[PDB]
UniProtKB/Swiss-Prot annotation, chains A, B:
Residues of the full protein shown: 22 to 132 of 451
Keywords linked to the UniProt accession: Activator, Chromosomal rearrangement, Cytoplasm, Disease variant, DNA-binding, Nucleus, Phosphoprotein, Transcription, Transcription regulation
Tissue localization of expression: Lymphoid cells.
Protein name: Interferon regulatory factor 4
Assigned protein family: Belongs to the IRF family.
GO molecular function: DNA-binding transcription activator activity, RNA polymerase II-specific; DNA-binding transcription factor activity; DNA-binding transcription factor activity, RNA polymerase II-specific; RNA polymerase II cis-regulatory region sequence-specific DNA binding; sequence-specific DNA binding; sequence-specific double-stranded DNA binding; transcription coactivator activity
Induction per the UniProt record: Not induced by interferons.
Annotated source species: Homo sapiens (Human)
DNA sequence: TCAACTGAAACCGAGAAAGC
DNA sequence: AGCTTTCTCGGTTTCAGTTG
């Protein structure tokens, strides 16, 4: 399973604005989640994390495949949904604000 | 897939005035479609089918959610649009009359 | 004026399928 | 094999834009 450490690395990297830890224990984080239809939407910035997952897993090849941010978003979402390593704290997510984000908890390796 | 048999059941039920079959083969039907801004509009009657779909899918809970007929209508419209089981006969729909309705064909499961 | 309405497209959870 | 990520499906939600 690559998702757990890859995502932890992405947050720890500080390369994705808004992809940040919410506590110092590094067990809860925010992941920017902007709807791709908004005017506010900028693919280069708002799709960067989804694309990186597609690039990292080889499901998209720069220069060869047509860019498809909607598909990229679905892949990371479904991976998070089915992952036993991550749990959305849905009551804490902020999808209705100008810079929307979902909140995820990282499950301890024992549960 | 729940919409096809659910809607057939609603028509067959006869509980929704104006929600009726257009032939005896039960392959074409009418769905009352009154604009919610009209004075003629009665929520309890004109939104009953839309509400029933929202209740059936758990998208509206009495005691939890505020009544919102426009959302109920949008939900059923978009589902009909996207479903391969139903096709609007737009030339037969009557949106310009005092009791407006849309006409739908039910596509055979073989197509 | 603005609530309701719209097609199109983006989005969604879940189970099957695919992949390690 | 058993685990993790992806594909498929049947709707749902949101978008800019229109309508009554």
């Amino acid at each position: 399973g690559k998702l757990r450490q890859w995502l932890i690395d992405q947050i720890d990297s500080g390369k994705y604005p808004g992809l940040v830890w919410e506590n110092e224990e590094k067990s809860i984080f925010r992941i920017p989640w902007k709807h791709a239809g908004k005017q506010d939407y900028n693919r280069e910035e708002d799709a960067a994390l989804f694309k990186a997952w597609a690039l990292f897993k080889g499901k998209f090849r720069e220069g060869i495949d047509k860019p498809d941010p909607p598909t990229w978003k679905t892949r990371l979402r479904c991976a998070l949904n089915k992952s036993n390593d991550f749990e959305e704290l849905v009551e804490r997510s902020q999808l209705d604000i100008s810079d929307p984000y979902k909140v995820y908890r990282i499950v301890p390796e024992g549960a």
